[PDB]
């Protein structure tokens, strides 16, 4: 015979109103008459806000930088609304509406004449930022499944993690970073300026500790 | 058969140069010498 463990009871998680995701529009309620440059520092480096959870216990953890326009948000919201349970699951958006303007000129035009016209709008997403958060009274298999289904469709790398999974991954990351055999850490060489390496490196590498490059994220750099 | 674009050292698509073992040993010994210098310059 085999043992029969008690099933996890769900009685402290109540579903609020509107379990489905809201509609995301293209341009905001007011257009920006001042054309802004394409500042690339909004996706380079670790994320500051929207890192931990808030209401739900499952969220998609980003592992790279990139821009998401109206089509990506529409695809994500449609997939969520078509692959969920409205009486047992509910998701809340974590990223704001796209507001960064992008200027595009005419096709087949000479270089010059100022900037072009504003077409669509995107939003900056850094590494380690939760894209969407979903909770409810379900378990972990199905939610991880239909969240990785969408994360594989995202341009940048993303995985479906939770609270315990994030805790375990941070624990093994710090365990690997505190038990290094070779005594030559990237931080020790970058901060103390060894062998004149500061000539070919970058001032942003002092805070990244060699864990970021442009927009990607290597979790095996240590 | 495989053709390299304009200049295999500058530009976008370039021929990547990698590391072997002699370079690693040289970096290790240089880091050891520099750590010894740091230790002797700490008093």
């Amino acid at each position: 015979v085999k043992t029969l463990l008690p099933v996890p009871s769900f009685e402290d998680v109540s579903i609020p109103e509107k379990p489905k995701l809201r509609f995301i529009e293209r341009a905001p309620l007011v257009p920006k008459v001042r054309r802004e440059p394409k500042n690339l520092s909004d996706i380079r480096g670790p994320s500051t806000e929207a890192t931990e959870f808030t209401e739900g216990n499952f969220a998609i953890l980003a592992l790279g930088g990139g821009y998401l326009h109206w089509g990506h948000f529409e695809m994500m919201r449609l997939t969520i609304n078509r692959s969920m349970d409205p009486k047992n699951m509910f998701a809340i958006w974590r990223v704001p509406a796209p507001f960064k303007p992008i200027t595009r000129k005419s096709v087949g035009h000479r270089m010059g004449g100022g900037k072009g016209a504003i077409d669509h709008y995107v939003t900056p997403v850094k590494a380690g930022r939760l894209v969407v958060e979903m909770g409810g009274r379900c378990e972990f298999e199905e939610v991880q499944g239909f969240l990785d289904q969408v994360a594989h469709k995202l341009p940048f790398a993303a995985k479906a993690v939770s609270r315990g999974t994030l805790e375990k991954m941070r624990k093994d990351q710090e365990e690997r970073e505190r038990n290094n055999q070779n005594p030559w850490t990237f931080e020790r060489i970058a901060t103390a300026n060894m062998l004149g390496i500061r000539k070919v490196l970058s001032p942003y590498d002092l805070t990244h500790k060699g864990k970021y490059w442009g927009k990607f994220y290597m979790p095996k750099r240590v | 058969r495989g053709r390299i674009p304009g200049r295999q050292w500058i530009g976008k698509h370039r021929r990547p140069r990698f590391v072997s073992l002699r370079a690693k040993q040289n970096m290790i010994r240089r880091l050891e010498i520099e750590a010894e210098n740091h230790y002797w310059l700490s008093m």
Partner: peptide, 25 residues
């Protein structure tokens, strides 16, 4: 000259690559 953030990975410098290869886990 390229920007700091691009999509084609962009191979790093030779010294930076040597430093990342000698300082692995």
């Amino acid at each position: 000259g390229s920007k700091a953030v691009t999509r084609h990975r962009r191979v790093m410098h030779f010294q930076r690559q040597k430093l990342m290869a000698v300082t692995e886990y």
